Structure formats: structure tokens, C-alpha cells
Ligand binder design. Sequence first.
Ligand SMILES: [Mg+2]
Ligand SMILES: [Mg+2]
Ligand SMILES: [Mg+2]
Ligand SMILES: [Mg+2]
Ligand SMILES: [Mg+2]
Ligand SMILES: [Mg+2]
Ligand SMILES: [Mg+2]
Ligand SMILES: [Mg+2]
Ligand SMILES: [Mg+2]
Ligand SMILES: [Mg+2]
Ligand SMILES: [Mg+2]
Ligand SMILES: [Mg+2]
Ligand SMILES: [Mg+2]
Ligand SMILES: [Mg+2]
Ligand SMILES: [Mg+2]
Ligand SMILES: [Mg+2]
Ligand SMILES: [Mg+2]
Ligand SMILES: [Mg+2]
Lengths: 164, 73, 119, 155
Amino acid sequence: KEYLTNERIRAKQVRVVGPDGKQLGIMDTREALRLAQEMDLDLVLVGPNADPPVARIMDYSKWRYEQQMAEKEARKTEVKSIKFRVKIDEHDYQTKLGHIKRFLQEGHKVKVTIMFRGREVAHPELGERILNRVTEDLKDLAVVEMKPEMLGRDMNMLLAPVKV
Amino acid sequence: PSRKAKVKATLGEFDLRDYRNVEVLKRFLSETGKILPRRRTGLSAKEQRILAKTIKRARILGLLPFTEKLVRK
Amino acid sequence: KRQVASGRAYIHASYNNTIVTITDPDGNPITWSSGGVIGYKGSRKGTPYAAQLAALDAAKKAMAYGMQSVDVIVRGTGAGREQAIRALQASGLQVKSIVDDTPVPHNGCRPKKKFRKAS
Amino acid sequence: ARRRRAEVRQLQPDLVYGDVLVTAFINKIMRDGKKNLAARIFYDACKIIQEKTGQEPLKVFKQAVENVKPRMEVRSRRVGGANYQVPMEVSPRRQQSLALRWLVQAANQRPERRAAVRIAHELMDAAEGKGGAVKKKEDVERMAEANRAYAHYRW
RNA sequence: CGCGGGGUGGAGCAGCCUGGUAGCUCGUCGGGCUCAUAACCCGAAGGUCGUCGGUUCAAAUCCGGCCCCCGCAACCA
RNA sequence: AGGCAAGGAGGUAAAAAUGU
RNA sequence: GUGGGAGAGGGUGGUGGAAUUCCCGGAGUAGCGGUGAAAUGCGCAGAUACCGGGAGGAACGCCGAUGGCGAAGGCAGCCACCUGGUCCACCCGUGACGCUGAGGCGCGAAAGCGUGGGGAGCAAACCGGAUUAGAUACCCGGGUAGUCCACGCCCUAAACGAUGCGCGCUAGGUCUCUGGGUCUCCUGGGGGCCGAAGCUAACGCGUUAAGCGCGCCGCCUGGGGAGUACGGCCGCAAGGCUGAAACUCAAAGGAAUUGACGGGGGCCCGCACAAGCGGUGGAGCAUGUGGUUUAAUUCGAAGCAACGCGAAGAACCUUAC
Ligand SMILES: [Mg+2]
Ligand SMILES: [Mg+2]
Ligand SMILES: [Mg+2]
Ligand SMILES: [Mg+2]
Ligand SMILES: [Mg+2]
Ligand SMILES: [Mg+2]
Ligand SMILES: [Mg+2]
Ligand SMILES: [Mg+2]
Ligand SMILES: [Mg+2]
Ligand SMILES: [Mg+2]
Ligand SMILES: [Mg+2]
Ligand SMILES: [Mg+2]
Ligand SMILES: [Mg+2]
Ligand SMILES: [Mg+2]
Ligand SMILES: [Mg+2]
Ligand SMILES: [Mg+2]
Ligand SMILES: [Mg+2]
Ligand SMILES: [Mg+2]
């Protein structure tokens, strides 16, 4: 994802855009560089595809750093995927339910996802049967986000906390 | 494996149980306040033990160091 | 604003960060440097190079208080105690001596579980 | 590669100037084994150098090489479960080779028409202490300094 | 009816607020990796940001209305 | 000064489920 | 008995520093700590690191051992007290007073529980963070009981030398610690190691025997069921002792041996990775295959070692559909 700086800029007449919400026109590469120098914020080819390449006057590195930080923040609060079957047992089901409950308590969203084989005929019903029941059980902690929808080789149900 | 000198060897005849005898005693300690072992002192097990006890007693008084510092490093 | 020329350098070293505190010959600390002081967060914080850098920084700081006379005191062992010492020797101070001093317990309280298995 | 250190090849040196480095450079330039193609190219570049920047073309090349030779390089080791870019010294021959490679890359990376010309220009830049090869070298040096901590994983 | 907040690749959510420059996780499909399955990794596929506008050289972004979704009150009668 | 070795350091030896 | 000796034996009273934390004081500022990486965590009310003191509680560095003590559990700062065991030397006193021990009585780590205190660290549970498909876990940040003491109770253990105690005999050597000697060597008592004979299923044991005997006690008669039920006793509880059967399986096992295997070690190798040059995957097409479709898409080949393979020549032929 290269928004390109200073003399990473090959294009002749770049659309020299300012830092904020201003422009300087469609000016040369050298001109753009000079402008960047003036602001001390780098010249950055943020839209190369655009009607002459969009060349923002921004400090590139700092911006990138900020973006990275934001990304990191986004990493976390999160979603737990509880994977059911068609051939899954009653004790197993209970275990899964318990896990889901724990997750809810913690403050995590819940993708209860069923993983299917062949017999996508007597798969969907069983997926519903398990998942619906589970949802009914955890109603006290959980507002269902996504209902039991069959999606080709899988089935999803999702639960969100009522409150945390 | 350390063969410079032995503390009993460099020495003449002396008493083990006198803590009040620091000159002959500051010899069994390390540069750091630490007791030299059998293979650095050269005493009988029994004798060594006695010496250790005496050293401890001295420390408790204040004659010999509990510890100090190693230098130069 | 204090001005001393004379004193000591403690290098306390954990394997996580090799800290260096410069003090006057009383035991009153003027200026100090560690890994995070030289930016360095985490992993590298207590690497030999980091320690060296910290030492250099400390020396520089001391110099800003006309300081020359410095008695080294290494407390514990970290990633770079020896390197730190070397840096100090080089850095720009009249070094007194490298005093080796561990804060070893005389069989104290129970160590942590990481420091368990030492037994 | 587990027995002897395995010899470096004994290059037949240059026909024109009388040097092995030159030959090596030529070889580096040449892909597809088309030597007298690229040897000619090299000679053209030399000529250009002589004309443009009035100086002995071998000497210029040598200077360029010297400029781009990096004494510190970066390797890579997975240690602990994290991949540290390892800063280490370079052996002389290896360093030289690296420099040559970089020069050749720069010659290709240049925006102008004819290869010989490009090569010549690149060499001139290197001699000056500038261009693409030099930049690459600088970057490498930085890397061997922004990672100078993990230095202790001494291979 | 009164007020606040939000509507975004299939779902959850970042970014809006500070005009230009849309990300991650789950899901879809394909591959890899593996002796093989999950797990894994990668991609590839896939959003104009509810919508109609205007602003401005240029809107997810500044602004209005409608459409929704959440909640709080709705009093004297 | 090197020669070997003893001991103390500290760095490294990541993680990776199953069964035709 | 007398003369000695060694020792972390036990209890009672004290003290001695390092260290930790916590408090005050000082100087000092931008992070510390933490990790395979990180994050939670603390820090500008100023942490951390450094010095000065003080407050505690706990443990005892070096010596320290492959060592010493006890009957075992166990036990280490040091000193004092009370106090056990034991070893030698003299062979002086007694004249078989002994050995063993069902029961019984006593001790009995650690955890646990009761009553009261104390509480620094560590730290189950627990609350966090990461790690992870998941994380009740390994890793980090806290954190309660507990660890510590008194008094009471609990009585189990890989309570191990997995070797019941007692004595007599049956090569040595070698190191150790501890006593006496006529002291470069003898002779006792312990602790180890190597090995004669012998024993053993082999490993190994081998004067500290698992050798040869004798003495007495404890227990065993396939594994699982199960140290469970059932009773009985004990306990404030947790549980403990005491201890089956029904059924079920033709095994449960030990010791070694050959291999194989190991995210066991050492020594090696190979284009195995690195170092390098050029690709493959992205494009079209050439082909072979899987899948799918067909009236039939003949049949096989299957990870490396099936996939420009049989096919080194499919228009009919070939050809098998
Ligand atoms: Mg006596
Ligand atoms: Mg303070
Ligand atoms: Mg008699
Ligand atoms: Mg008589
Ligand atoms: Mg804790
Ligand atoms: Mg977690
Ligand atoms: Mg947890
Ligand atoms: Mg913890
Ligand atoms: Mg209690
Ligand atoms: Mg037993
Ligand atoms: Mg008995
Ligand atoms: Mg004994
Ligand atoms: Mg003996
Ligand atoms: Mg025999
Ligand atoms: Mg033997
Ligand atoms: Mg037997
Ligand atoms: Mg039991
Ligand atoms: Mg009962």
C-alpha cells in the first residue's frame, strides 16, 4: 500500500493536494517536492490512479505510524467461534454451551459455527435444532445477532451480549 | 581447577577456635566476604567445620566480614 | 545546577533491562539511563548493545555536570553488564574501579516460580 | 557444502584492461550467457565515462565499487519464535560480489534507453557517492544499525 | 411527538468528529502447507459507506430531509 | 603472553492437534 | 563404670548480617517492570534505579559435600540452657539379664481443619493479560486461604535403599567421615563406589548382600473391578485404617534383546537450508490428471517413487469404450 514520497514520485504533472482540504493544482514532480519541503510534510502520491496522481502534502512516516497504531487498537472486545457438528453428543453440546456462556460473561461476541460433511439435506435441520436450543438456553446473557442460516459447507449462529 | 596456594600450608601453627585472631582468619575468607572451601583452605573436614563455626561466631560479633565486594571485574 | 565532578556509577542489571544510575560520592543520584531512555521498548531493552548505549547516555549526562571521577558498582547480572562497563571505561570518565556487587539474599524468602526450580 | 570451504573460481581477468574485478562485473551484467553482448556493453559504458566524465574508466569503476562496498550486512535468524534481522560483518570477496550485484541492479533500475549508457551513468553516480547503488548500500548499513542490538546472536 | 447516538465488502465492527487517501476479525471460494483432516498460511473473490441532494477543485467525512435501528422522557389536561 | 581445565555468570535449545 | 570423641539429633530462651517488602527523609525524571514476542500492571500526586534511617515478618547465603545426625518423618546463622542417641579405649563391674514382636502406647513430612495471633515474600482458589481453534493450562500482573507461631487434631506418602529387625559366617581394593594406636601403616564404628566366591529373570547385589544360615514379625497368591462397596472403628470435617465380592478379561507385569521412533544427545553427511542464478504459482496456450458431462468419454497409475505417466505418434486403424 504505497502512498509514495518525495522522489518515489515518477509521474510528471502530479495533482499537488495540500495536507488538509486544499489543493495547489496539477503541478510538476519537482514543484510538488518543493511544496512538500515548504510544509516540511512529505509529498505523498495517495491516489496514483486519479486524474493526474493525487499528491498529498503530509508527513508520510508519521501518518503510517498512526495507521499502524490504529490497526493495533482495532485488534482488540472480540469474537469467539464455537464450532458444532451434526454428529456431536449431548455432553459435548453442554460443554459447548458452557463455553459460550463463559465467553458471554467475559464480554465477547459468539459465532457458534457448525462444520458440515455430506448429507447437507439432514444437516441444516440439525444445525437449527442444536443452535436454536443453545440460543434459547443463553437468552439471559445473549441477544442473537445472526440466526441459523446455512452457507454451503457451514452453518452460522451468532450471539451478542444483552449487557456486560 | 585452582592450584595457587593453600591457606593451611602458607601458615604455621595456630588455633581454630579463636575468633579474636583476625589476621590469620581474614585469610580463610574470599575477597568477597565468603568462606573458602576444602580445596582452597586445605583443612580436615572436622577442622574445616570448626573453622567455619568460628568464622560465623566472629561475623556475629563483628570481627570478620559477612560479605564485602569483589573488585576490578 | 548542582555540579560535582566526583562520584559513582551504579549499573543495576536485570536480564530485562540494564539500568545505569550516576550518583555523587554521597549516594545522591544526579542522572540515569536505561534501555527505554534510549527509546528501545521490550525485547532489546536488556541486550548488551542497549546496555552500552545506556551507559554512554549516563556518561554524557554526567559530563553535563562536569563529572569525571566515577566508581562503578554492578548490581546483579543482565544481558549486558560487562558491555556497560566497557562503555563506561571508553565513554569519557575517570573511572575509579569496577566494584562487583550482587544483592544476593543470605537464603531469604521464597523466590518466584520462574526463580523456583533453582530450589 | 559440508566438506571443504570450496574454492572461489579463478577468473581469467580482462582482455582490455587486465583485471579480474572487471571480468566479474561483465559476468554480472551478462544474463543468458551472452558475454560478448555484455562485454561490448561494458566497453561502451567505459567509453561514455571517458567522454562524459574525462577519467580512466577502470579507475572510475573501482571508485564506484569502493563507494558501494558495505562492510556490515543483515542476515536472518528465527530465535525464540521471533525473526531477528542479524547484523554482521562481511567477508571481502562476498562484499565485492554484493556491490557488483547492486551496481547491476541500479543499471537496470535506471529510466533511460540504452543499457551501456545506463551502466555508465550508474557507475558515475557511484563514483560521485550517489545514485541507486549507493542508496541501497546506505539502506543496508542502516538496517545493520537499526538492528544492531540483536548483534549478540552471533550466528 | 420531544431529544441523543448510529446506519459501511455477506456479519461484526474501525475510520467520520480532524474533506481527498476506506482497515481488521469472522464468513465465501480457490490454492498452499501436510502422508492426510482440521488447525494453519496465503490469497482471490468481495463496500461508496441507508438514501435524495447540496457544500467544495474533491465528501464515509461538512450540512439538511426522508428512510430505518437503539434508547431515554411524553408534563399541566 | 598463550596453554588446558574447574566454577560462576548470561545468551541460545521456540511453538506445532490428531489417525486411513 | 570410668576416660574421652564426633555431630543441621530434639526442645526452651535469646540474638547476627545479607535480602525482601512497607513507611518516612533526601537527590533525581520518563519510564520501569515484564517476554519467545507482547499486553494487562504500576508512574508525574514523580515511579524505577541510588543513598540515609526506621518498621516488620520469614528464611538462613558462603562453609556445604558424592558429607554428618537420628529409628523414621526429618535437620543446617550463631550462642546459651536443658536433653536423647551413639562411638571408641580400658577390658574393670554384672553374670544370658538377650533377639523378635500379634495387639497396645508414642512419634510421624507436606497439605488439611479447629482456636487465638502474626503476616514480608511466595502464593492454590480467584480477578486480569496474553497464548491459543478453545485455555478452566503451561508464560506474565496482581491476588485470598495457606505458608509462620502457640495450643489442639488430623496420620497419609515414591513415609524409598521401592531392600522388616537381630546375630553369625563368606576375597580384596578404592575413596570418604569419625574414634584409638607401637601414626608413611594398623585397628574399631559409620558413609559411598568397583568387584572374589555365591545369588539372581536379568538388571544388578555383592561384609551397609538381594550370598550362605538361623530366629521372629509383616504381607503375597492373575489384572481390572478397588483401596471402591458393605459393615466396624477413628476423626470437628476432609478422609483414614480395616477390606471384599458379583462380574469381566487371557491377559496386568518385570528384566533384558533386536529394531523402529523421539519438538533426546554427540559425530557425520546431500543443492537439504543458507550464499547465488533462473524460474513455478499470476497470462494464453501446449499437454496429462482430478471433477463433471456424455450413448461412451476404455482401462490403469495416487505423496516423495500418479499427473509431456503406459502411449516412442488416437482422423480410420490403433482401440480395449
Ligand atoms: Mg561417656
Ligand atoms: Mg521515596
Ligand atoms: Mg570381667
Ligand atoms: Mg562375679
Ligand atoms: Mg503473588
Ligand atoms: Mg486470556
Ligand atoms: Mg484465567
Ligand atoms: Mg502467577
Ligand atoms: Mg489455619
Ligand atoms: Mg511400601
Ligand atoms: Mg519393627
Ligand atoms: Mg548413619
Ligand atoms: Mg566400613
Ligand atoms: Mg562370579
Ligand atoms: Mg557392586
Ligand atoms: Mg529375590
Ligand atoms: Mg486413600
Ligand atoms: Mg464406612
